[PDB]
């Protein structure tokens, strides 16, 4: 009852005092010395026109080529981005797919959605056709995100407020991470794959240790659902975007919000967030049909993509650093650089 | 291009061909989203039963006049629905089922209808309202043990409209209660939406077996109104 609420009440007050003590100079004042990146003009080089319904997810392959994408038409598509060739087309058992992932080895693709099942498909088989290697066990809510740790380990986030770590070989939940309050909407892996962050509908993000399965840290500051999350390339910070039309850059070590990216002229929610190769450019897709490119340090709109006719749903920068691919509800994927 | 590049382009073209064929085949049929609280008979609206894709969300398939309807019921979770609903912003219609027999939860159903109607993503989707279990409503109003005025004071000052047409020769009090109950929902619907999407109330009971015909007719009306919107008659 209230006996333990007081114990938790003082703990919340104390940690806030630690955060205020830790902060002396804001990030903006520190970075005021440097010169701005300047206007960033980015052009469309390819347009992928095979999807017959709105697209919810895409994931770049590790070879800076062969991206994968998922839409409500009940189809996964593996594209050769250089030539716009359709390498693979995978039928889905359930057309309600909300996420898709590409194995870093390039041998598997994972997709899940309203069916509560994270399917893993094998790309490289002797038979020559893509087959369902494993339908993973059940969540108690829809799947919002999934990412491959390796060819045998996957990490999923669900609408049952819980993330999970699965072994593909056994097909069982190796670890089940503790509860959020609301839906878990986003998920990002650290570069070393030792930690990972999750964003929830409770306007909070949580940093988790994969090996021990216990929430290491918790970050707050948003005002609505957190829709997207992404580590900094060096793994010491991460940015989130929420329905309150704002992005936040938090730092893991300082355990405190570092920067906020918002503009009075922007009011729609943010659907996707990703960084550039050096982390200076923060790319965010919005609900008003266009993406924005912010200077991650000086925090100003360095550019606009502005090429989609509908809601921008998914957004991803290639590992090599050449290009950024955005997929929208107009059933189109566009590659920019 | 080399020989391998040409063969890859050919394979991509074949993939495109299959994609378009599947797309037109899928575009042929109609898709509905079924909503309503428990203890409302939302699974009994259409007599035919199915267990299509029972994992996760629930699928039903029924054919009327040689046109196929796929009804999706996201019944796995009893929690907030505000997130996955945006995946359904392209269905033909939202079939909202309300059990009008019980007056205790009726305000909750009205609030749910208000939340659905004024949703940001469903601002262009028509709602087909099914007032289920009208026989229990008639029995309750005829018994007189429980009164609407305990929960709705305005029912004291409400009177049946001159356009009321009680067809089966029912009691006037039953018709008065039914029309007030439907009036609450149509008042919620009319306060916003400005004709972009409209509600189609209906009355039904558990033993009723003609709900498929009503769904088909109102879907035809929705398609007709979108067509007239395309040619800019509206």
């Amino acid at each position, epitope marked *: 009852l209230d006996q333990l609420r007081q114990e938790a009440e003082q703990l919340k007050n104390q940690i806030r005092d630690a955060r205020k003590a830790c902060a002396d100079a804001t990030l903006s004042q520190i970075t005021n010395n440097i010169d701005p990146v300047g206007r960033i003009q980015m052009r469309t080089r390819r347009t992928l026109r095979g999807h017959l319904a709105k697209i919810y997810a895409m994931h770049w392959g590790t070879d800076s080529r062969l991206l994968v994408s998922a839409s409500q038409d009940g189809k996964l598509i593996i594209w*050769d981005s250089y030539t716009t060739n359709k390498v693979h087309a995978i039928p889905l058992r359930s057309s309600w797919v909300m996420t898709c992932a590409y194995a870093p080895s390039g041998n598997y693709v994972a997709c899940g959605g309203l069916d509560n099942i994270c399917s893993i498909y094998n790309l490289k088989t002797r*038979e020559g056709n893509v087959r369902v290697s494993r339908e993973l066990a059940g969540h108690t809510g829809y799947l919002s995100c999934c990412r491959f740790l390796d060819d045998n380990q996957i990490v999923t986030s669900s609408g049952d407020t819980t993330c999970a770590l699965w072994d593909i070989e056994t097909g069982q939940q190796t670890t089940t991470f503790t509860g959020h309050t609301g839906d878990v909407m986003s998920l990002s892996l650290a570069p070393d794959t030792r930690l990972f962050v999750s964003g929830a509908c409770d306007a909070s993000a949580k940093l988790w240790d994969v090996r021990e399965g216990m929430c290491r840290q918790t970050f707050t500051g948003h005002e609505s659902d957190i829709n997207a999350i992404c580590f900094f390339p060096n793994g010491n910070a991460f940015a989130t975007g929420s329905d309150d039309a704002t992005c936040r850059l938090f730092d893991l070590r300082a355990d405190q919000e570092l920067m906020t990216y918002s503009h009075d002229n922007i009011i729609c929610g943010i659907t996707s967030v990703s960084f550039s190769k050096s982390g200076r450019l923060l790319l965010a897709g919005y609900d008003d049909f266009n993406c924005n490119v912010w200077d991650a340090l000086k925090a100003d709109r360095a550019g606009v993509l502005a090429g989609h006719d509908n809601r921008v749903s998914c957004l991803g920068v290639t590992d090599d650093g050449m290009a950024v691919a955005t997929g929208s509800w107009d059933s189109f994927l566009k590659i920019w650089n | 291009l*080399s020989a*391998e590049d040409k*063969a*890859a382009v050919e*394979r991509s073209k074949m993939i495109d061909r299959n994609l378009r064929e599947d797309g037109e085949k899928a575009r042929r049929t109609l898709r509905l989203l079924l909503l309503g609280a428990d203890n409302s008979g939302k699974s009994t609206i259409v007599k035919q039963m199915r267990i299509l894709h029972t994992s996760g969300i629930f699928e039903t398939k029924f054919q009327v006049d040689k046109v196929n309807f796929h009804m999706f019921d996201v019944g796995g979770q009893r929690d907030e629905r505000r997130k996955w609903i945006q995946c359904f912003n392209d269905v033909t219609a939202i079939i909202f089922v309300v059990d009008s027999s019980d007056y205790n939860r009726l305000q909750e159903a009205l609030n749910d209808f208000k939340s659905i109607w004024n949703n940001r993503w469903l601002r262009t989707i028509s709602v087909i309202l099914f007032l289920n279990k009208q026989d229990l409503l008639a029995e309750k109003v005829l018994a007189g043990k429980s009164k609407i005025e305990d929960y709705f004071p305005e029912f004291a000052r409400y009177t049946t409209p001159e356009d009321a047409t009680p067809e089966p020769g029912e009691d006037p009090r039953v018709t008065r209660a039914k029309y007030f109950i439907r009036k609450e929902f149509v008042d919620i619907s009319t306060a916003s939406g400005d004709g972009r999407h409209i509600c189609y109330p209906h009355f039904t009971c558990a033993v009723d077996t003609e709900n498929a015909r009503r769904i088909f007719n109102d879907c035809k009306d929705i398609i007709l109104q979108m067509n007239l919107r395309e040619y800019n008659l509206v």
Partner: single-chain antibody, 232 residues
Framework: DVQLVESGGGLVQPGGSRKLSCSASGFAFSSFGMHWVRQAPEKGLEWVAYISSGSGTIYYADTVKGRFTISRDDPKNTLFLQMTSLRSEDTAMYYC??????????????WGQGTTLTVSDIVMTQATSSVPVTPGESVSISCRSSKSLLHSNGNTYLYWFLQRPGQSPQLLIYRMSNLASGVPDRFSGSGSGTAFTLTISRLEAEDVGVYYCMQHLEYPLTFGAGTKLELK
């Protein structure tokens, strides 16, 4: 359990007609282009014909152009070769080869058993036709092309095939330096855009056989003379 069994070979009179069939099982046949490849009884491999996936593209060799027809039946998973005006040079083994083409595919991955038949361009040069060798030591086999095989996209198309005695050929390197699936890692391929070398680090008893290098830059497809490795 990929399997391709062909039939139809037999004794025929010169100028006759014949039909060769090949049933495919264990794989998605309709998604694979298919090849007919000739091996003369005492000479090396020679490409004959190629049917594409979906029958969109058909390619023939000059020596059999017009009088040979290649056809495919997906529902029965079957391949047909109709041969007319048979000659003495058309007596061969007639292997059937699988193939698939996308960004990272490995064409010519699987080969059929072949059926002996008897009757009543870029040049591939192999410097050596035989190399005596002892097990346990490194070996290198080089071949050369008239025209550089390196396309503008950065891919150079040379394939390495090992045919053990009394066996159908198998693929080893499906590009410049791309090891095929199921091939032990001791094999490797290297070289420039015109001269290409296959390198084997350690030799066992199963490595004895003929080695062919093939080009795939453009049609027709031409094989090498073949380097024979025998244990010693």
């Amino acid at each position: 359990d990929v399997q391709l069994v062909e039939s139809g070979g037999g004794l025929v009179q010169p100028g006759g007609s014949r039909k060769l069939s090949c049933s495919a099982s264990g794989f998605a046949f309709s998604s694979f282009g298919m090849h007919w490849v000739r091996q003369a009884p005492e000479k090396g491999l020679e490409w004959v014909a190629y049917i594409s996936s979906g029958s969109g593209t058909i390619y023939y060799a000059d020596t059999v152009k017009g009088r040979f027809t290649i056809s495919r039946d997906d529902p029965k998973n079957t391949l047909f070769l109709q041969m007319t005006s048979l000659r003495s040079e058309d007596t061969a083994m007639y292997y059937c080869v699988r193939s698939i083409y996308y960004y990272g595919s490995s064409p010519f991955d699987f080969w059929g058993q072949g059926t002996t038949l008897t009757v009543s361009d870029i040049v591939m040069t192999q410097a050596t036709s035989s190399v005596p060798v002892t097990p346990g030591e490194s070996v290198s086999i080089s071949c050369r092309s008239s025209k550089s095989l390196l396309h503008s996209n950065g891919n150079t198309y040379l394939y390495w095939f090992l045919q053990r005695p009394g066996q159908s050929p198998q693929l080893l390197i499906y590009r410049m330096s791309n090891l095929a699936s199921g091939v032990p890692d001791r094999f490797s391929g290297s070289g420039s855009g015109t001269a290409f070398t296959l390198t084997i680090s350690r030799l066992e008893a199963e490595d004895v056989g003929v080695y062919y290098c093939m080009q795939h830059l453009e049609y027709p497809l031409t094989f090498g003379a073949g380097t024979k490795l025998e244990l010693k």
